[PDB]
Paper text:
MAG adhesion maintains the myelin–axon spacing (periaxonal diameter) by interacting with specific neuronal gangliosides (glycolipids), such as the major brain gangliosides GT1b and GD1a.
The exceptionally high-solvent content of the two MAG1–5 crystal forms (91 and 85%) aided in obtaining phases of sufficient quality for initial model building (see also Table 1 and ‘Methods' section for details). We observed unmodelled electron density in the 2Fo−Fc and Fo−Fc maps of the deglycosylated MAG1–5 structure close to R118 in the putative ligand-binding site20. Native mass spectrometry of purified MAG1–5 revealed a mixture of free and two ligand-bound MAG1–5 forms with mass differences of 835±2 and 854±2 Da compared with free MAG1–5. The 854 Da ligand might correspond to a similar tetrasaccharide where Neu5Ac is replaced by Neu5Gc, a mammalian sialic acid variant not produced by humans. These ligands are likely co-purified in complex with MAG from the expression medium that contains beef digest (Primatone). The resolution of the MAG1–5–ligand complex (to 3.8 Å) is not sufficient to determine the detailed structure of the bound oligosaccharide. However, the unmodelled electron density is compatible with either of the suggested compounds.
Author numbering:
A (entry chain A), B (entry chain A): 20 to 448, 452 to 506
Write the structure that this text describes.
């Protein structure tokens, strides 16, 4: 054929082991020179620029960087120029050209070259996506290009994961071999961040090459941080925390009542509430969702505040004996105990209830007066006042009398009634020049107090009769005298 | 001498009597004709214009208006041509010329003529000013020019006035006589407007001639119309009347307090007062003054109106047992009876006095309350209100108790005091999580009503002790319980 050569492009082995660069070459058959000679140049391809001599036919003298480090396999007559390099060092990493020298001027450095890689760590392969719920296999590939040493693979750190299935050397690229050992297992959610190792060693040697890899198994989110039932005060500051554990980024969503609120892709998400209202009260849910699953939790938020000022509706005015129904109603976030009461006495009390009802079957006059409803509670108390008035027929009090002075007589009669009664004075006497009797009447509470003055009345005290009328009834007391 | 004649200018007598026109004439002595003749022409002086012939020598034929009515006295030889005309009538009033006819062409009508007045009424003379206090004389003159009849004068209507002093005939002007009768008297104030008369009559005849005159005696003013003590209402209308009796115009002057007010020259003078004030009250004097005297009277004017609203000054605040002095003072035009009083009781009363004083030696708490001072009176009543407050050490009322409910206990203690006392609750227990006790305290009158609620207290009722402090004192009641 024509000039040329076959050689692997890339080839590799470990520090301290050998390599075996396989090859083959060709020259024009047209020439028949016996004793085919060749040379192996490191780094550089042509003689002009002196390269290190890896091998040269019928010369023990080579580069000191290969002395006792190189040897050729195969008769070059059969065009077989495979080269072995024992005891490798990082220095020996480089490109290796091959050149042939048959006869004179028939010398050719072949353009195809192999590049020698020297690694000190094995190769662990892992698929891009490693879902937790799915079986996933991983391999371990080590360049078995050495005829003198035979690597054996050992999964370390595999622990509880399934046992390794060993495989032999396999064809890599064109003309290079590699020993592979597989590993079949299933990953827990936790498995992410676990360090998995593969070790290659050689039976008689002290050579051991370890190599690590940390897995990245994807798992759905599990909400691990969530508040218990939160009970907060109005206007206070409320921080809700939703934590989530997921390998892929999780999406966090705060929701309540079918609404959006706050949403973010993070490991934890705060919901800050300022100026808290009873409308903020309710159950809040945090939803965590990932393409690989989801999880959600709820928390009951309870807003607590002192009850509002009580509202009292019912009956304000009522005649005697009628039945007065009064209810005192107040909404409160924390259940509260409340009570209503007049001065000097407490009418009714209810405990931990929304509203209290007071009923007075028959109403005496003493029921007239202002009342108080207090909505007592842990977080504060507010009250409200309501008045209850009671109407009745006027009652002329026996505190009434006719005191006479030396020249004139004057009388006082007091009655009580809620509708202020028409006071009047009568006396059996005819009409006189005036000298007109004149009364004055001031009112305080239910009491109508009125004082008459009859002037120039004879020493014999005149019968004075007091009468007062309201809508409901009438009364008339013939007044007494208080001499000396 | 020369031609000429003497004759009275004016001369008069009554209807029905005679006249006696005296005369005398003269002609040039140079001529000596015997048998001097003359004529008396009425009205006209010369013959050309025919006049009535009163007399003509040696002719019985005269004017028919003088036939048997005329006659001549004295020989014309002695130049005496006096003429008498009996039975006079109003017709015979006129001028009378005299003319002489001695010889031919020696005829002369003398330029001097007498005019005959005929009156039917006497002449009464009165001085211009007739002061009442002064003696004043009046005369009565009657023309005594008749030789045949002799008038006699008689004062009629003179009555109580001094008797008349008769006088004889007196020389009037030149050649006429008049009978005068005087009258000496003194005039009362009343005498003005009195009719005084003088009558002349003749003994044998039926002829009587009366003549009157009404006197105008000046007298000082005497105030005869004057009001008694006038007692009037404010804003009413007041008419003061001052009447005065005087012949000359009197000057009327209304005065008070040394001031002018109203002044007028009249018989009566009104002082009208509208919108009467207590400042109008006082004594008003009416002065009457005339150049001939003066008189004056006074009237007390009293303005009456309901008392003003009472003013109460003194002490409003006072501790227990202290003495409270309060006075209620009110000015009033009509004296009024007033009184002060609380509800249901009347403290004090005074009658017909300007002010009333109330004193409360020791002040109990029940003295706290509003008081009324009413200034009662005939013409209206007004009042005023004053409050009296009384401070004292708080008194914890035995209406207080500790009522327990099934889950919680609540206590009520009421105290009374005017300075609102600091209520407090104590109990022998250490500090607990809260669950904080909470009290409510409303105030009404002197009563501080307060209710505690102690929550979750064990079935065994805890000792509750109520304490209240004011400036004056402190009290503490260990409260009781009311089971079932
Ligand atoms: C041709 C070429 O691309 N070479 C360039 C380089 O120059 C080389 O220099 C060396 C120095 O000894 C040689 O002269 C070489 O030619 C020879 C050799 O000795 O390798 C002569 C041989 O006889 C000849 N072949 C045959 C069949 O006779 C060989 C052979 O053709 C080549 O080696 C094949 O690669 O070549 C010169 O080629 C030098 O200029 C470098 C850098 O500039 O560039 C090369 O392209
Ligand atoms: C002079 C005179 O003022 N007279 C005026 C009037 O005229 C008279 O008319 C009468 C008519 O008879 C006489 O003519 C009068 O004269 C006499 C008489 O007869 O009275 C004539 C007498 O002789 C003569 N006196 C003497 C001494 O002789 C008298 C005598 O002198 C007067 O009487 C004296 O008063 O007069 C006329 O005088 C006549 O015109 C009236 C109206 O117009 O006015 C007279 O002034
Ligand atoms: C009277 O009103 C009662 C309660 O009033 C309502 O509730 C209170 C807490 C406040 O919110 C107030 O504003 C509300 O109006 C009712 O429950 C009751 O049925 C009503 N009925 C009447 C008029 O007696
Ligand atoms: C308090 O005042 C008394 C009276 O007040 C006066 O008289 C009354 C009628 C009203 O006219 C009022 O305007 C006047 O001021 C005094 O008489 C008394 O002296 C006073 N003394 C006090 C202050 O106690
Ligand atoms: C070249 O020699 C090597 C070592 O003897 C051998 O492995 C390879 O098969 C040979 N190649 C040939 C003969 O083509
Ligand atoms: C909820 O829990 C977080 C810790 O995970 C805490 O910081 C926060 O205060 C809690 N929320 C409330 C309202 O206490
Ligand atoms: C929580 O997730 C479940 C499924 O895991 C879903 O059925 C449910 O509706 C979710 N709840 C909320 C409030 O999102
Ligand atoms: C109730 O009546 C009292 C009088 O005793 C009065 O002071 C108060 O203002 C009244 N309150 C209402 C709400 O009517
Ligand atoms: C005129 O005569 C009368 C009457 O005889 C007489 O009164 C008067 O004195 C006589 N006058 C004389 C004479 O002068
Ligand atoms: C005073 O008296 C007159 C009558 O002389 C009378 O008209 C008037 O009304 C009186 N005045 C009063 C105030 O009565
Ligand atoms: C009244 O008149 C007398 C004299 O008649 C006099 O002294 C007195 O001052 C007068 N009074 C008045 C108030 O004018
Ligand atoms: C007096 O006190 C009463 C309360 O009992 C009040 O209603 C009234 O307005 C007070 N009056 C004065 C003048 O202070
Ligand atoms: C080798 O030398 C050159 C390389 O192409 C050619 O002349 C021929 O292929 C020969 O075999
Ligand atoms: C009368 O006549 C006239 C009047 O004066 C005069 O001549 C004389 O006075 C005589 O006596």
């Amino acid at each position: 054929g024509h000039w040329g050569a076959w050689m692997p492009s890339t080839i590799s082995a470990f520090e301290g082991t050998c390599v075996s660069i396989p090859c083959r070459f060709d020259f024009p058959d047209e020439l028949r020179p016996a004793v085919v000679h060749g040379v192996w140049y490191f780094n550089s391809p042509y003689p002009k620029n002196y390269p290190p001599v890896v091998f040269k036919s019928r010369t023990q003298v080579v580069h000191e960087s290969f002395q006792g480090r190189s040897r050729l396999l195969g008769d070059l007559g059969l065009r077989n120029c495979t080269l072995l390099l024992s005891t490798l060092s990082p220095e020996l990493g480089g490109k290796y050209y091959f050149r042939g020298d048959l006869g004179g001027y028939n010398q050719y450095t072949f353009s195809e070259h192999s590049v020698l890689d020297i690694v000190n760590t094995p190769n662990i392969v892992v698929p891009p996506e490693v879902v937790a719920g799915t079986e996933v296999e991983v391999s371990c590939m080590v360049p078995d290009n050495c005829p003198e040493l035979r690597p054996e693979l050992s999964w370390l750190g595999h622990e509880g994961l399934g046992e390794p299935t060993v495989l032999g050397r396999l064809r890599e690229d064109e003309g290079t071999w590699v020993q592979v050992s597989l590993l079949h297992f299933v990953p827990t959610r936790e498995a992410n961040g676990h360090r998995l190792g593969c070790q290659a060693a050689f039976p008689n040697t002290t050579l051991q090459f370890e190599g690590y890899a940390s897995l990245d198994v994807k798992y759905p989110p599990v909400i691990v941080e969530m508040n218990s039932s939160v009970e907060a005060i109005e206007g206070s500051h409320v921080s809700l925390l939703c934590g989530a554990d997921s390998n892929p980024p999780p999406l966090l969503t705060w929701m309540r009542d079918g609404m959006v609120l706050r949403e973010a892709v993070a490991k934890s998400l705060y919901l800050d509430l300022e100026e808290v209202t009873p409308g903020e009260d309710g159950v809040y849910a945090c939803l965590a969702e990932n393409a690989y699953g989801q999880d959600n939790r709820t928390v009951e938020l309870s807003v607590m505040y002192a009850p509002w000022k009580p509202t009292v509706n019912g009956t304000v005015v009522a005649v005697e004996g009628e039945t007065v129904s009064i209810l005192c109603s107040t909404q409160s976030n924390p259940d509260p105990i409340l009570t209503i009461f007049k001065e000097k006495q407490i009418l009714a009390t209810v405990i931990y209830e929304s509203q209290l009802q007071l009923e007075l079957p028959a109403v005496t006059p003493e029921d007239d007066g202002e009342y108080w409803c207090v909505a007592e509670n842990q977080y504060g108390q507010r009250a409200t006042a309501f008045n209850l008035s009671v109407e009745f027929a006027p009652i002329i009090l026996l505190e009434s009398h006719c005191a006479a002075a030396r020249d004139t007589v004057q009388c006082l009669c007091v009655v009580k009634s809620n509708p202020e009664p028409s006071v009047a004075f009568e006396l059996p006497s005819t009409v006189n020049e005036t000298e007109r009797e004149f009364v004055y009447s001031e009112r305080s509470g239910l009491l109508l107090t009125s004082i008459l003055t009859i002037r120039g009345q004879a020493q014999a005290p005149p019968r004075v009769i007091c009468t007062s009328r309201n809508l409901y009834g009438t009364q008339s007391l013939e007044l007494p005298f208080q001499g000396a």
